[PDB]
């Protein structure tokens, strides 16, 4: 007899893989300064 | 004789490409503050 | 009569879904000392 019809065309793909993670973020900034010292000692007293 | 049957699916096509890279991290949070500075020197001499 | 020959092959996939957000970036470093503190007062005159 004949031939039959050819077939559909194939399914679609499956989705691709899942992306890579982002990169780390960057640094962040220095901390502020630290408070000033302590006042210093007083001067020697005067002599008499 | 009757037509043969029509011709089964197509192969499946290919899968799709990794996703996109996720977004960027997020920036670090600030440093600590610094130590005091050192405590001030003595102060001058009193006079007589 | 015989079966037909198969369809061809499908067609791709989608690209994946996207990657995971990066990590955070590294907390920054401590800040820098304070300054030194205050010079002390002078010491006072001797007494008479």
Chains 1, 2 share one sequence.
Request: net charge positive.
């Amino acid at each position: 007899g004949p031939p039959g019809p050819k077939g559909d065309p194939g399914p679609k793909g499956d989705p691709g893989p899942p992306g890579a993670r982002g990169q780390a973020g960057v640094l962040g900034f220095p901390g502020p300064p630290g408070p000033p010292g302590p006042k210093g000692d007083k001067g020697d007293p005067g002599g008499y």
